[PDB]
Every structure is written in structure tokens, then in C-alpha cells.
Design an enzyme around this catalytic site. Structure first.
Site, short mmCIF file in Angstrom:
data_model
loop_
_atom_site.label_atom_id
_atom_site.label_comp_id
_atom_site.label_asym_id
_atom_site.label_seq_id
_atom_site.Cartn_x
_atom_site.Cartn_y
_atom_site.Cartn_z
N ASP A 83 0.87 -1.17 0.00
CA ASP A 83 0.00 0.00 0.00
C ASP A 83 0.90 1.21 0.00
OD1 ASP A 83 -1.55 2.31 0.95
OD2 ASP A 83 -2.98 0.89 1.82
N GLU A 105 -1.11 -0.91 -4.38
CA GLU A 105 -2.34 -0.20 -4.06
C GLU A 105 -2.06 1.25 -3.83
OE1 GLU A 105 -4.95 -1.61 -0.94
OE2 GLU A 105 -5.41 0.42 -0.25
N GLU A 164 -9.59 4.74 -2.40
CA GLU A 164 -9.97 5.09 -1.04
C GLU A 164 -10.05 6.60 -0.85
OE1 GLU A 164 -6.84 3.20 0.97
OE2 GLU A 164 -6.17 4.95 2.12
N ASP A 177 -13.58 4.00 0.74
CA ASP A 177 -13.97 3.92 2.14
C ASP A 177 -15.45 4.31 2.27
OD1 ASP A 177 -14.40 5.14 5.00
OD2 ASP A 177 -12.62 3.88 5.22
N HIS A 222 -12.03 0.05 1.68
CA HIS A 222 -11.01 0.40 2.63
C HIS A 222 -11.59 0.32 4.02
CE1 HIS A 222 -9.20 3.63 5.21
NE2 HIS A 222 -8.13 2.90 4.95
N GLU A 268 -10.96 -5.97 4.21
CA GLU A 268 -9.75 -5.44 4.85
C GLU A 268 -9.97 -5.18 6.34
OE1 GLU A 268 -8.67 -1.26 4.40
OE2 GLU A 268 -6.53 -1.73 4.29
#
Ligand SMILES: [Mg+2]
Ligand SMILES: [Mg+2]
Ligand SMILES: [Mg+2]
Ligand SMILES: [Mg+2]
Lengths: 403, 403, 403, 403
Positions: free
Chosen positions: C224, C250, C278, C300, C327, C347
């Protein structure tokens, strides 16, 4: 309380070097050097396929223009200047044409004078080279005067540094030495071209393999191909140098060959960059270049249109998430690229004949011209009015025109 | 001889207006006006499809932010400032976050402070609006201080005017009147949207036909659609207004709808322009916007990222042969666009409630703020240090945060 | 026989955390933690190229917003709530703006209230971040109330689970530990960026190689990159990690850089995924993101627009044969993604400072908030009214606005 | 406090109509009508180029399937149902196949049962029609049960109305009459096809010109071409009807002809819409359809996959800024599209044989099934548990299979 700005009284142009003066003069022309310089040692060119013009670029005429110096004097008698590569012919352009747009404007009228020089020469410039070299010089002369008149570095006028120091890589035959001088990487010329086939590729790749062995894995290595290749040759070479982590391969093709660059970038080894731009001029050419999808564009500030053009090229690269890394032009690049978030490093092109000393980039022509000590230059160094340098008038400046 | 530059001691932000002070405050928020203003008279919006929020934009909350004022004080005690649309929430951002990057830098460190504000808010800005309004304000505050410290207009720092005067068109309900005041054209809001179907189109087209009859063939007519339409509605409307030579149709779609704008431009009557941009922020969004092929991009200097962003947007438009015409933001646009060869005209947005007087664009908040007399502004008018204006501190500035 | 639904009486917003309360508050802000958390340990960011802001994200201001809590009370006195990342500024938005659309509607009027919040804030939201965080919170608050009023989990309202249990991978510094807790995979942050060159790549690739040696071949490994890279750096890194079967890489780029993502995906090693999302908000942004051809989109739920937006993003991904993997946002994601056939896994982002305990994802703010025991959560666990949790009112909730 | 949900005990399917019962049965099959209905009066079809099958669609077999009724009974003995077009063959599918996935799940397990029906029939469904009609019916049956069990309208489960009332246009031979009943527009069938050449075009265009004269300029006019054309014929016809402001032209081509639709949309008169979708099934087909760039997609809720598919199609259209306007399927569409911001209007298809009465859309089969009184339906009307209707069991329902 308002600073009062002078008009512009005179524009003057001289030359050192080229086919009408002292060959080997240095200064604005990078390739006006002597015999036995690295920069003329069997470098691959468009011409190097011809046996008379293989050994030397100087032989095919790479040195015939020489330095242009352009100086602009305000009526308060203060001056600014800059240097580029046009010489006597560039003196004609400044003095029989461009002066009608420079003379009598305000010192701050730089973009207008720029637009007028572009508009008026459009029928004979096309898109770069000699005329655009001249245009860029005038443009930089103007920014010098204005920064001196104001008492500020060009870099502060432009809105300040985004980095405390410029990092440099070094261009020329000795990456190993440049690593000892503290440079972040080293870019070698290619020596063989398409006409040399696989042997050419083997030979140039071996020179990279050797300097990887010498410099180790963290020091950057690059190849500069000065317009000398085609797509297939460039792709074979990029792939040969891939085991050695060549960072990028640069100027493989003549500047017109936008579609070639597109195709080259498509064929590049994963993670390897393709670059060009030093023979491109005008913002609009660079739009076309950017859209080939090459990674880094490389205007010369003295060749591309000037600082005025360069700031636009930087914005255009940054809109695309691309870097702009100018073809090294000393203080002119410095004051620019220290403000560019998308120029994380810069080029020092060795004018030292064997790449062992930090000889000034524009030696002899520029007084107190900085060098990358430990391959760095701090922002505090550039903190002088204008571009921060003076014209070495000891030099044998010829003036073929006035008006 | 080198001008010595102060550090930055304090950054301070106040607000007038919005949902925590005096509604109707004017200033930085264009749409913080009273009842019975043209700018709130049944304008088509995304919300205007709902019967409670059809009549007034003020009803759906277009006025809740108010003016942000941001002032930056150097240690020599000299100040610079600017205004934008964020108000109390923008005060929080300046005073609980952004101040860590502003305070203690040099006055000339504008691009660095810009990059740092962009980098640090990226997780919560996304791509424009409130946070970016705040960023732009700080950015313009910084350019004011620097231009004042140096004793120069922003426009001369940027490299000078390319035109002696800025030409304006006027935005609002009365093109006929604006024609008498000497403006070059007039841009009306649309009043009906997609939910009103053909009757909506007929109605808005008739308002254009009427003002063409009144203004004659040489005065420009435009329509501004404030995000209110879809592609089909926008295409029916553009075609309805074609007999009357509508110059362009502007902001038909919500700013995310890049693919919509592409398609709209493809469907536009021959010769008619499509425009957008005033709700776009960041250089990179504008790269995406430019590539839809719309004709003119229209950042608000106070909303898009600031003057620093705007100069990059102008370069990016100019690389493509496109115009940039900012969404009218008084002196902030003026000092910019008088240097832009690709801004041949600018926008005056009528803050006069019935579009009959040249009321100042940012009234009351800005002292000696110029107006387009005879729809023009000469370069000599802007020839004051910084952005050339002062903060009306008689105004009832609230300060909800310090640090 | 028809269930009778209450109106909506009050909407209230408080905050814990951020620059106007207790730093380290946890809860809705993932990055409002203490010193010596994994989540602030030298993580690569856009800012990490600057030496003051390299070590800590908390230093550049990643923690200044804090938690937003938004609670909605029906007239039968029943409540629902949710949490997100906006804090005091988000309180202003709810309480000086958005309340006009929430208050007085039916509890089931969620999509309408959603559309109205989107329509009204369009001029200042742009496309995500702070305003959209606030919008998403209201949206989730509304779904909680409605599910509580009805006496059903959100997941059953949406039309039921398509899987008996949610599988999780774990995000943070210790994949080896997460493998022992029963997680299906582990995602590490990158620590070095573009400015660190090849050494940065070597360093981050070695951290993956190590955890591959530790975890063996079947446990998933991901990287990430939190917006910190460019295309070239991301491509060198993806290729460096390929020998170790990195599942995906990511958020390599700032969210505006759609064309960058297109190009990155083109350059990715065969079989390796590219992901983002996200920091994207609005359905329309995600249309643009999807069409870059990245593999997995990662809204998210608390940042992207809300559960209402998320169900549309999932449909849009599924039309394309792509996954959506949100997210990690605890119960808000859970009740969603247990119904999504195209979310085969989810996640868990370690809020445990050293990634050794299953500390609650939204600790302390959420009462009886479930954890992935054995990196799983059964559907039977989520079988509570609404989102199935309560507001820890022991927490020191500040209320800066009412209306 | 948690509502307790029943399992699913039995799924049962009957039929009225089709080639094994009473021809003219009405109900779920729109085209199971008598002689001398408008819907069978010389309508252009793929078959209408053949002289036996020109006059009547009933002759080529448009009526052979009849109504499917599918009823699902929970173990608390509560039922839900819906109707579609499959009849006896659809009874086989429900009762010898699909029942294994329906029976024994929870009432809220709709998406799972959906995915399982899609997964299991994939080898014999392909992509729509008979099998997908059956799948959609089961899906709607399930949503009815669940909404009844909970005691809520489907529309509230889905997150509420975004409009107080649904606006309708009317489909059939009499736009003039439909204008008097208060409908917003009227859509006529075409009567001639490609084999009728220019005379066909003249004839159908004259029928539009006539109803424009009758209805005036604000009432909408559309043409529905039931798969009968090619691109050239459709383009000549669209252009013939342009002087009369035909809003859109619908289903010109067989559903496989995605590339035809792309090309047709390219050739459409400026501002005129192209639509399709009613013979498309699966989300993924509609992704392909959407990307042809047609303006409006038109699933039948009973044919496309069900309400579960439809909500995904709506999200997919809305990501693109496109409308979804379902092919009129009474309450099933109603409870859906009253929540869809991107369905600003809906279709009433006249089952009245001469388009003079508001005969129920699904007459006789559905008890207290609402009609667009004054071409509107208020949200308060739909405020019944489930889909709000009951099965007319007086009808002669045959049951060819049990298990
Ligand atoms: Mg070079
Ligand atoms: Mg506008
Ligand atoms: Mg992430
Ligand atoms: Mg039809």
C-alpha cells in the site's frame, strides 16, 4: 511603495567562436571545444554513418555557430545578458529584426516581447534551432536585466525554491569519476549506430556493464544517443542495457519522429525511461512530444524558447505527472528548476575534456558561474540579482551588426 | 545589489458571512447577497428540480460558507492578504493545519508552501472545493505580501502585461445594459433545467433571442448553466440557441462528468464553444478537463488552487491552442490574465442586484478595488504593489481560531 | 400489515479528536493514534520527500480532523448514528447546512436526503474528502436509524448475505503475526518513495521477500503506497516484488491521476493487480477510475459518499467483472460487502500499535464492535438491528454547533 | 429489538395463457390479448417482412408463452408472488431446477438465491429471454415475500422515494387520448419496416406529424420499433421524424447488435435519443449496451434478471450520466424507479385495446393494482407491504409440475 522601472534603451549582440572566429572558443556553444575532448570522441550521430564524419562531430560542422551573447541595457544604464548557440547569424536576427520589439518597452515586458519575437519569426523559425536559440537568448537577457533591476534572483521572481539544493548527474565519458565528485548518476554518449548492427550494441552495452561494475547499484547510469538511431536499434540497445539497470535512454531519434518515440516507449524494457526534447522548440512541439508518452522532456533553456517557454513546458509535464529535466544550461536552468517540483534532479554536462575536473558549464564566458561541488548546488548560492553572473569581456567578442 | 527579504511571522484568518454571521455579507462569497438579487433569481441548479429549492439557491445553502480572509504578516510588519469562499471552516484549515507550512518560511517561498499545502491536505481535499478554496486564498495572500514587500504588482513579477488593457464581458441578467456600459458581451444564467423539458428550452432560448434583438449581431451572448443539465438537454439547448449565434454554453454538467463533456463538445453546433472549469481544482483535474476537448477552461483563481495553479492551467491550455478565461475574481485574475496571451478577454460578474451599476466585484471587502469602466481596465490601473488593494477592516470580521 | 415509520426530529453532530481536542483519540480517524504506532512509522506519502515530514504523517497534519460522530433521532425517540473523519468542520456542515435536508423527512428517505446533500454541496465538495466524509456519515447514520427502527440489520435490508462469513486480510507492519491470527493475507505500507530511487525499491522489496519467506506461498502479500509514487517508480517496484508473488500494489498515485493509473496497469507484471479508490468520492469519479482498467476499487464507506454510493460502486464494478474491496470501515463495510458477490474478501486495518492484537477497528468509539476472530466474521454476528453497535458516550464528545 | 425472519418452505409456479391454455389471457404476458388490439395491429417486427406474419405478431407466435406466476410461501404461512412471461416452460424451470436454491433459505436471502439461479442456469439461459424471465419472476416473488414479512413496501426497503410521484408517458396507438388522460407523452409503434422502403418511412413519419399537430409542442412523442429495422432504415426514419421533435426512437435493432446501436447513435439527429434494453438480460449485457452510448436503457424488470439486476443497471446508467427507464412492468418497476434519481419518468403500456381507458397494466391477474390517474402515481399509493398487490386466483391457473 511602488518601485519605478526603467525602459529598455539598447539591445546589443556579439559573438565568440564559430566559422568566422576562434574555433575552440567554448562558452555558449557546448561543442565549440578543442581536439581530444570527450564530447567529440567518436559519438554516434545522424552523420556518423559516413566515414568522413564518423570520428568527429566537429568535422560535419557541429561547431560552426559558436556563442551568441545578447545584452540589453536599460536607460538607468543597468544591463542584463545571456548566452546561447547562434553566433553571427543570431547577431543578425537580434540586430536587423528583433530589436524593433525589444527597444523601448519596459524591463518587465518580457512575455510580450517573447510573443512578438515568436509571432514575427514564425515564417522563418520553424519550431526550433537557430532562430529559436536567438529568441531564447533575448528572452534570458531580459530576465537577467529585470532581476538585476529589481535586485532579485530570477528564482525568487518565479516564486521561490521548492528544494534547498539542486542534485546533479554528470554527462560524459567518466561516470566512475563523477561518482567520486559526488554526482547522483552519470550519462554516457553512445559511440556506435544502426550501421554498426549487433557489434555496435554489444560495444555500447559493454561500456554500461563496465561502469555498473565500477559504480555499483545505486549510482544512476543513462545513455544519450544524439538523434543517431532508429526504433529497432534503440529497442535492441535498451534491452541489451536492461540487465544493468540503465535508468533511461535519451534522444534516440531525430526530433520530428514523434510517432517513432511513441513506438519506442511502447517497446522499452519495463521500468526503463525514454527521454527527448533538447532539439525541440516551442510549447506546442512539446505538447506533441509529451503525448508520445515519453517519461522526461529535456528542453535546453537556451534553445527551446527561453525561460518563458520552459516554465510552460514544466507546467505541461506536471499536468501529466511527468518530469522535465532540462539539457544542462547552467544558471538559466538553475533558477528555473529549483522552483519546479517536477524537476527532482538536473544535468551537468562535462566541459572538462576528460571529465576529471568541475570545469564551469559555460567556461570561459561567464564570471562567478557556480559549479556542482559534491554534485550539489545550494539555493543560497543562486541568491544573486538576475541570473547571478557577469560577461567575461576579456573574451574576443566580435560585433558584425548594429542598427 | 541584493534586496533582503523578510521571513513570515504570522498567518491569520477571519471570516465575514455564512451561517455563523451576517447573511448577505458579500465580499469573497459571490452568492452571499440579499433577497431579490439577479444571482438568486430562479437559476437552474442540480437542486432546482426540487420544488423547495427551485426558486432560490440561497435556500439550498449556497450562502453558508461566506468570505474567508487570510492575512500573512512578515517580520518587517508588512502584510499581504486575499479573500475566497470558505469562511469559518477555512479559518480552521489555515489555523489548525496550514500554518505549520506558512509560518517561518521566506516571503518568496510561495510554490514550496503551495506544494506542502497540496501534499498535506491530499487525503481530505480531494481535487477541489472547500479545502482548495482555502489553499488558493493562502496562495494569493502570499503573492500579495511578496509583491508588496518587493514593491511590485503581481503582474510585473509574472513577466509583464501582453495587453495594454483587459476587455470584459458581463455576467448576469441584463446584457442590454452591459452593452451600454461598454462590455464586449453578456452571459446570462439559465433558469430552467432537464425536468422542464422542451418548455425549459423554449423559455431560455427566447431570453437569448430577445437579447440578440436588443444587442445586435456584434455584442457576444453566452449561457451559463451551473451544473444543472445533462448531455441531451445541453445539446437541445445549444442547438435552440444556434440561430442567435450564442458564443458558448458554459458549465452544463457536474465537474466529475468528463466523459459527458467530451460527448457534449462532439454534439455542439458548428462553431459554438463548450466551456467549464470553475468547480475544478488542481492542475491534474484540468489536464483531464482539457482532454475532453472543450474550448475554454474557467478556473476561479480563488477556488482552483490559486495563482500558482492558474499560471500552470494557462500554460496547459496554451500548449493545446485553447483559451483559459477565469471565473471572474477581480484583481487576482487581473494580474494573471493580463500576462496570458491566451486570455484575450475576461469576466465581470455583476454583484449589482439588477445589473445596472458597476458595483465592485468583491464589494465591500476590498478597498480601491478597480471596476471595468467602459468594460475595460488599463494595465496602468493595476500598477500597484501586490494585488493593489486593502482589506476593509470596518467589516465585521470574526476570528474563531488562533494557534 | 403496514409498519408505521417515524419522521426525523433532530440531527446532531459531535467530535472527538483533531486539532481542537485530544490528539490520539482513535475512533473514526484511523490516523488519530499515539506516538510509536505502526501506521505513522516512516510511511511513504506525497510529503515524505520533505525531511521534516518524512518520519511522521502526524507531523504534516494527518491527524487534525479527528472523528465525526453524527446522530439522528426519530420522533419515537429512537436513534441511529455513525462515525467518520471530519471532526469539527464536519460538525459545521451537518449543523449549519445539511440539517435542512435531514430534519423532517421520513426515516426511510435516505436516497433523497443523499441526493439533496450531493446537489447542495456540489459547489464546495468537489468530488470527495472532507465534505464527502460528512455526507457519508449522515448517510450511514440514516441507515442505522432505519435498520434500528425496522429492527433489522442493514445487511438484510439490502437483500441478504451471499456468504456465511467475511474473510479478512490484515493491513499493517506484521503479516507474519496476522497469519497466526488466521487472516488470509497481509498488506504492508511502503516506507520509501521516488526520491529514494533504487535503494527505496530494494528496501521495500526486501521487506516483502522477508515476509514471503516467513508466511510461505499461500498467504497473500500486498503493498500500500498511499499516493506517494509516480508511474515509473510504481512500475519498478511492482516488478521488483514480482518474484515474491505480490498480489497487488495499491494507491500508487494521487487520485486525480486517472491516466497514470491506466498506464501503470498497462505496465504491471502479468497477473499482478493494481488498485485504488480510497480517496475517490462520488459514483461518477469511480466510473472514471473503473475505466482506467485497474483491478480492484477501494472506496472507504465513510469517505466515498456512504453506503448508498457504495452499493452503486459495487454494481458498477460487477458490470465490468471487477471486484470492489472497501477500505476497511468496520460494520459499515461489513453489512454492505456480505451482500456483494464481487467482494470475496475484506480489509482489517490494524489499530493495534504493533499489529499483535485484534484491537477493534474503530476503538474506542463503538460499543460491541466485532473483530475478525481467526480472520473471519460470521453473518450471524452482524444479525443486530441497524449496523449493530452503540456510541461510546464516555468518550469526550465536543459539540461546537447547534441550530 | 431484532425482528425474527421465517425460512422459505415452498416455491410454487402456475400458468395462465399461452399455447396450452386460454389464448387472450392477459396478465404477465402483455401480448396475450384478443383480436383487434392496438398491440397486434400491423406492428413492424423481424417477421413482418413475411406476408403471413406481417399483419399479426400473434400469428408468428408472440403469445405462446403466457403468464408465469411464481409464489413463495414462508413457514409462518405468509406468501409473496410475482408474474412474468414464460408460462408452462417457466413452471418447469422453477419446479424441476430452481427450487433447490429457493427452498430452505431465509426470506432475506434474495441476492444469494439470485446468484445461485444465475450460476446454475448459465449453461442454458444465455443472457436473457425465457430462462431469465423465470429468474426475474422468482426474484420478484422473493422481494414481495420479504417486504410483506417485514411489513414494508419494497420502495422503502430500497431506501425510499426520491420523488413524491411517478410521471408516466403512455405507449400505444393514441397519443392524443393519452394527452387528455394527463400523460406527459406518448409512444407509438412503427407499422412498416426496411422492406417497405421510403413509403414505410413516409407512412410512419406522417403518423408522428399528425400527432404533433394534435398534441402540440410540449407533449412528448416517441417511436418504438420492436427489433424490426437496420441502421440505415432507422437513420432515415429518425431524420424524417426530426422536424416534429421525436424525443427518441426505441429498439430499432435485434439485441445482439451492439455495434449497430453504436453506429445508429452516431447518426442520430442532434438532440434525438436512441434507446434499447427491453430484450437484454444480465448486468453484463447492459454494460455492453451502455457503452454503445445510447441514451436510455430499458430493462423489463420481469425479463432482465429481476429487481436485483435492475438496481445494478440503474447504478450503472447513473455512473455514466444516463437514464434508465424500464419497460413498463407495473408495481415491480414502480417500487424500483421511485427510488432512482435517474428515472425522471416511467412507461405505461396500454392494455386497453384502443387506448381510451386506463385498464390495469397487468389486468386481470393483479388485485388492487394501481393505475396512473392523470398520468401520475403518488408514493403514498405504493405504501403497502411488498409490491402491494394480490394474486387473482379466480383466474384459471394451471399447475403442470410439482416436486
Ligand atoms: Mg542529450
Ligand atoms: Mg459560471
Ligand atoms: Mg490503502
Ligand atoms: Mg418497447
Amino acid at each position: 511603495n511602488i518601485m519605478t522601472l526603467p525602459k529598455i534603451k539598447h539591445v546589443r549582440a556579439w559573438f565568440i567562436g564559430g566559422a568566422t572566429a576562434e574555433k575552440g572558443a567554448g562558452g555558449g556553444d557546448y561543442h565549440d571545444q578543442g581536439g581530444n575532448h570527450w564530447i567529440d570522441d567518436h559519438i554516434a550521430t545522424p552523420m556518423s554513418k559516413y566515414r568522413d564524419y564518423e570520428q568527429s562531430r566537429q568535422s560535419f560542422g557541429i561547431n560552426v555557430l559558436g556563442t551568441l551573447i545578447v545584452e540589453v541595457e536599460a536607460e538607468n544604464r543597468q544591463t542584463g545578458f545571456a548566452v546561447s548557440t547562434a553566433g553571427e547569424m543570431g547577431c543578425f536576427i537580434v540586430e536587423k529584426h528583433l530589436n524593433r520589439f525589444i527597444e523601448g518597452k519596459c524591463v518587465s515586458d518580457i512575455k510580450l516581447i517573447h510573443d512578438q519575437m515568436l509571432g514575427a519569426t514564425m515564417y522563418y523559425s520553424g519550431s526550433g534551432g537557430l532562430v529559436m536559440n536567438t529568441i531564447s537568448c533575448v528572452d534570458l537577457a531580459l530576465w537577467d536585466l529585470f532581476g538585476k533591476v529589481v535586485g532579485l534572483p530570477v528564482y525568487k521572481l518565479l516564486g521561490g525554491a521548492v528544494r534547498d539544493e539542486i542534485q546533479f548527474y554528470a554527462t560524459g565519458a567518466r561516470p566512475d569519476l563523477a561518482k567520486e565528485m559526488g554526482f547522483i548518476g552519470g550519462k554516457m554518449p553512445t559511440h556506435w549506430g544502426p550501421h554498426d548492427g549487433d557489434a555496435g550494441i554489444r560495444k555500447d552495452a559493454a561500456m554500461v556493464a563496465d561502469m555498473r561494475e565500477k559504480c555499483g547499484p545505486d549510482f544512476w547510469l543513462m545513455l544519450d544517443c544524439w538523434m543517431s538511431q532508429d526504433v529497432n536499434y534503440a529497442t535492441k540497445l535498451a534491452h541489451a542495457c536492461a540487465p544493468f539497470n540503465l535508468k533511461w535512454i535519451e534522444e534516440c531519434l531525430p526530433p520530428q519522429q514523434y510517432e517513432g518515440y511513441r513506438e519506442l516507449k511502447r517497446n522499452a524494457p519495463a521500468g526503463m525511461m525514454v527521454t527527448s526534447g533538447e532539439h525541440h522548440g516551442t510549447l506546442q512541439s512539446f505538447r506533441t512530444l509529451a503525448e508520445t508518452g515519453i517519461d522526461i522532456m529535456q528542453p535546453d533553456v537556451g534553445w527551446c524558447g527561453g525561460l518563458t517557454t520552459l516554465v510552460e513546458i514544466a507546467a505541461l509535464a506536471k499536468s501529466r505527472g511527468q518530469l522535465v529535466v532540462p539539457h544542462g544550461s547552467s544558471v538559466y536552468s538553475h533558477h528555473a528548476v529549483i522552483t519546479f517540483t517536477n524537476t527532482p534532479f538536473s544535468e551537468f554536462l562535462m566541459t572538462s575534456p576528460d571529465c576529471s575536473t568541475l570545469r564551469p558549464q559555460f567556461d570561459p564566458i561567464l564570471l562567478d558561474e557556480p559549479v556542482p561541488v559534491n554534485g550539489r548546488i545550494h539555493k543560497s548560492v543562486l541568491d544573486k540579482p538576475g541570473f547571478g553572473v557577469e560577461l567575461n569581456r576579456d573574451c574576443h567578442l566580435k560585433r558584425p551588426y548594429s542598427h
